[PDB]
Amino acid sequence: SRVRQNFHPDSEAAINRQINLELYASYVYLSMAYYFSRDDVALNNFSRYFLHQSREETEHAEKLMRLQNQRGGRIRLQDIKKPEQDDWESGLHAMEAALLLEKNVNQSLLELHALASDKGDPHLADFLETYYLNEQVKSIKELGDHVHNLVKMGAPDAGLAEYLFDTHTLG
Amino acid sequence: SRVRQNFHPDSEAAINRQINLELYASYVYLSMAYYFSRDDVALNNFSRYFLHQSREETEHAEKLMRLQNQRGGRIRLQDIKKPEQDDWESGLHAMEAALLLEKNVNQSLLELHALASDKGDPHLADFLETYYLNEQVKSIKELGDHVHNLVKMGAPDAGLAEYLFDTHTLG
Amino acid sequence: SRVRQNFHPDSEAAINRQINLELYASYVYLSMAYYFSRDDVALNNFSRYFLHQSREETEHAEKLMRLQNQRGGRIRLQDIKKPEQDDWESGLHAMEAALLLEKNVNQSLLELHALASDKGDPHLADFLETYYLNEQVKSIKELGDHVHNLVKMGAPDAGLAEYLFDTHTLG
Amino acid sequence: SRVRQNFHPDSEAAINRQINLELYASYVYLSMAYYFSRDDVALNNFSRYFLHQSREETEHAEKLMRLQNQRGGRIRLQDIKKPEQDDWESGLHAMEAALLLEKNVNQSLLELHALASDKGDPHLADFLETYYLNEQVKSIKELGDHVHNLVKMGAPDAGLAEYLFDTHTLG
Amino acid sequence: SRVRQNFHPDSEAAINRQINLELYASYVYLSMAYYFSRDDVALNNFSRYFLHQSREETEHAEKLMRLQNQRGGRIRLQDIKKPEQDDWESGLHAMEAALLLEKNVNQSLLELHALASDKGDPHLADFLETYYLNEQVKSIKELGDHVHNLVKMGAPDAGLAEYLFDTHTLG
Amino acid sequence: SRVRQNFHPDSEAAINRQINLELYASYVYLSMAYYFSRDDVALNNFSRYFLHQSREETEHAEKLMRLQNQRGGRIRLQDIKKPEQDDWESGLHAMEAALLLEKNVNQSLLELHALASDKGDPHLADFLETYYLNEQVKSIKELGDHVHNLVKMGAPDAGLAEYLFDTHTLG
Ligand SMILES: [Mg+2]
Ligand SMILES: [Mg+2]
Ligand SMILES: [Mg+2]
Ligand SMILES: [Mg+2]
Ligand SMILES: [Mg+2]
Ligand SMILES: [Mg+2]
Ligand SMILES: [Mg+2]
Ligand SMILES: [Mg+2]
Ligand SMILES: [Mg+2]
Ligand SMILES: [Mg+2]
Ligand SMILES: [Mg+2]
Ligand SMILES: [Mg+2]
Ligand SMILES: [Mg+2]
Ligand SMILES: [Mg+2]
Ligand SMILES: [Mg+2]
Ligand SMILES: [Mg+2]
């Protein structure tokens, strides 16, 4: 590529793997979003919350795809694995699953950053720091907040907990 | 499901298959969109066009997921298969692939409609007719228009064709 | 902490020490601010300048406290040491003391950054670079400018110097 | 000091002690504020409430520093002691600690007022009455209200109490 | 310098060399801009495009000069070498020359970043990442896009190519 | 050149030399501008003043480059020589150097005008008179004003002079 400069094939590959992971995260959140609009779940603000997260993950994927193009890498898409469950069990369980997902995505981003650093790719390093690392920290913190509140409120067994959390925190 | 009424498990299954197909179509268009943003393709309005199509396909998927929940079905997500190519070769080839994709999706929707009709599910039948069947016809027609113009203009070999089509038709 | 990820206890501790240092800097500037509104100093724009700096330092402290929470660290507050003087002697001396303070805070931030780097904490590294390192450089530069002008103008002995600097530069 | 008039050195000293106490109160509230932003507390309106209180205490400190300068006293800053805890245990416990803090600050202000009265300093007496004594009464009353509601609602053990109090009263 | 802190003389020198390189890039683009407004070239949007790039390069130079001052370095200006050609041959050739120039400038910036990293200057590292590295990637990508389109369109020999590219892409 | 008319190659050459001189003047002013932003100079309105002059010189250069193209001449760029100093010593010395620079540029413009007149090029003559000769007179007068005031005020040794001149005249 006539634009490619200081862009290691390993970084290119890792970016492609990260693209897939971001798409996967979008899919997970999409699944959660539509779990919460089931008639036997019907937590519309959980649904909206995860829908929003899903679209944010798509933007995360797209920024990496743009990065790949900008750097002269070649996007290599892979299957977006279905989420691990279709029944996310409860608002709390979904929040906990999302928290685990974000920490896993964060770990992947940190490994990607270590790779960028190993390859002396400050542009990639900065790209991750600018657009992903703090977004991950904020997302993990937010999910942590949500998990704690839901746990403290007695979710999922306390019938009012997820309902009230849905209307107040996620409203 | 206490909302489920006149909703055949075959229709539920076919809706889940259609959800996956719509997600797949979104993915195909996403791949195309970022193919045209490659430095060695750089047809930004092809890119935008397919990006828009990608997001519309996501809405197609979501409406079916909404339908599933509305009818008391249970969304069953599957892997979103990667698109058949990462290199979409040219604006014309991408348009032709999109055309083939839309006709395939249309065939799936028509089969879904035949199933809805077979199962006496007028709500599902109307749902497809209202939101999918004409949208598919419109999309197939548009892609056909685009394919014809690109062919007529000499794409992909005529160097000005895809460039001018990008700026004029997709602008 | 269920949010804690790639966050070394040393970094957590260093952030707590930095929080204290930022609070200390706020206090120093608060002291300076109210030194300059003494009836026998009465340099109201020196006062406002240092008051503004004081509040900025509080925001610096708060961002680190937020960082601590975001990363799952536990804020550990310590006494905010009183400033080294209550009588800041002159506009020039206060500016020079502030300059020294900022360079000391900068050194602490650079050590914190080296620690983040040593611990492979790019989020923390980026956090410091994004919110502190350049703010420090700009603050040190500004104080350097102020010190130079005050020195060149003949502060503190030239009776018009701090007065005119107060009204023009700090106005 | 050419402005000093009817300003007893005891009052000057007591004002300096009160400045420190107000700064200390600010610090206590700052600690509480960021306690409630912990991922395992995550009561954002408790956090905001105490943050607001913290900044109000800083204004309390500053008005006394202003008073010191206005009267020709000399501000003598002391270490701002760290708050007694970094872990404020619960919204209720923090409210109760804040209540105790405000009554302690109020006692100090009342002693300061008695001193002002003993020294025939009506300006200082009026200053305290105008800006501190009723503010303290209001603050103590508000915290008492909050404590009662939290207790009545079952805080901290009733999982919904602090959550609902956070969203409704502190919202 | 009383502001100088953690600023290695090598970094200072490298910044001065980078200032010159940025000024040089501005000059190259200025030359290109006025090449395209020759009566026998007369591609006014190529001209405007390179004029814009020229002024952007001046801002790149100025930010480095400001950085030098901010850090306490001493700007040391050198001759701005004339561009390698006055006759830039064609829109395509100018775009290709600009692409090569940007990659060369990028290489210099990456070397500067490696130096900053070697010298443990995170402020300088962040400065380059924040203001230069991604700007370079975007500029190289854009020029790559432009080069590809011009090549594909048949520039410079296809008489309509640069004309149409001028009006559509650079308009 | 099919536009070239009554345009002597000597005039073309002299215009190219004048372009370089205007670029050089821009560079001198750029150097001065960033000299006054040094932490040990810190005369921000001197800095702004010379920065403005620098950009005006670039416009002077560009109008001549425009003229060259308009007349069918061929721009021949040369190295832009670095300014004679990086340390401009004082606001007064910089003003005096700028004054000398402008008179030198003016002399070059007057020689260019004499050449235009010798070659019977009234368009070039008018071009210089319309856009350069009075601008030079105005600039030389302004710098003379500034030099006189700075001298009269006691610059550079009177510590308040350049400071006050910076804030009042250059503000
Ligand atoms: Mg993501
Ligand atoms: Mg496969
Ligand atoms: Mg599987
Ligand atoms: Mg569709
Ligand atoms: Mg029908
Ligand atoms: Mg600070
Ligand atoms: Mg202690
Ligand atoms: Mg002590
Ligand atoms: Mg780094
Ligand atoms: Mg108070
Ligand atoms: Mg009374
Ligand atoms: Mg540049
Ligand atoms: Mg030389
Ligand atoms: Mg040469
Ligand atoms: Mg000029
Ligand atoms: Mg005449």
Author numbering:
A (entry chain A), B (entry chain B), C (entry chain A), D (entry chain B), E (entry chain A), F (entry chain B): 6 to 176
Task: Show passages lifted from the paper.
Ferritin ubiquitously occurs in animals, plants and bacteria, and plays a significant role in iron storage and detoxification. It is a nearly spherical 24-subunits-protein with exterior diameter about 12 nm and a hollow cavity of 8 nm. Like human H-chain ferritin, the ferroxidase centers of HuFtMt are composed of A and B iron binding sites of conserved amino acid ligands His65, Glu27, Glu107, Glu61 and Glu62. Herein, we take the compartmentalization concept to re-design the intrasubunit interface of ferritin to create a new compartment for fabrication of fluorescent Au NCs, while keeping the inherent protein cavity functional.
First, to eliminate possible non-specific binding of Au ions, we made a recombinant HuFtMt mutant termed ΔC (C102A/C130A) as a starting plat-form, which is devoid of any cysteine residues. To this end, we obtained the crystals through co-crystallization of three mutants ΔC, 2Cys-ΔC and 3Cys-ΔC with Au3+, respectively. ΔC shared a similar method with wt HuFtMt. As expected, no Au ions binding was observed with ΔC mutant because the inherent binding residues Cys102 and Cys130 in wt ferritin had been replaced by Ala. Subsequently, we determined the ability of these three mutant proteins and wt HuFtMt as biotemplates to synthesize Au NCs, respectively, following our reported method by mixing protein and HAuCl4 at basic conditions and a further incubation at 37 °C overnight. Consistent with the above crystal structure results, no fluorescence was observed with ΔC due to lack of Au ions binding in protein molecule.
